[PDB]
Structures are given as structure tokens and as C-alpha cells.
Design goal:
It is built from 2 helices and no strands. It has helices at residues 2-34, 37-61.
């Protein structure tokens, strides 16, 4: 039980890192869209990838 508690407390740091990368990718994608079509699509793919990793971390934490 102690080891599991440590594992989730550390899985919070990955949730935090991918929060950071998601913010950066979302900024890039929205900047591309506001101004480009292909770059916007690719950047949205990256945004979805980071958010997917976040959702994975959230399910594991849950």
C-alpha cells in the first residue's frame, strides 16, 4: 500500500508535465489557426496526443 501511494504521488508529476506540454501545444495550434491548415492539423494531433497521455495518467491515478 505504501508503494502504491508513492507511485500515484509521482504519477502526479507526469500529469503536471503533460499539463505543461498540452498548454504549449494548444498555444501553437491556436496561433496557427488564428492566422496554416496543414500545420494546424498536425499541431492538433500533437495536442490530442498530450491530452491522451494526461487522460492515461488520470485513469491510472483514479
Amino acid at each position: 500500500l505504501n508503494e502504491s501511494v508513492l507511485k500515484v504521488n509521482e504519477l502526479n508529476k507526469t500529469l503536471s508535465k503533460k499539463s505543461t506540454e498540452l498548454t504549449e501545444k494548444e498555444k501553437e495550434a491556436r496561433s496557427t489557426l488564428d492566422k496554416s491548415k496543414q500545420k494546424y492539423s498536425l499541431l492538433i494531433r500533437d495536442v490530442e496526443a498530450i491530452k491522451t497521455e494526461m487522460s492515461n495518467v488520470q485513469a491510472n491515478l483514479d
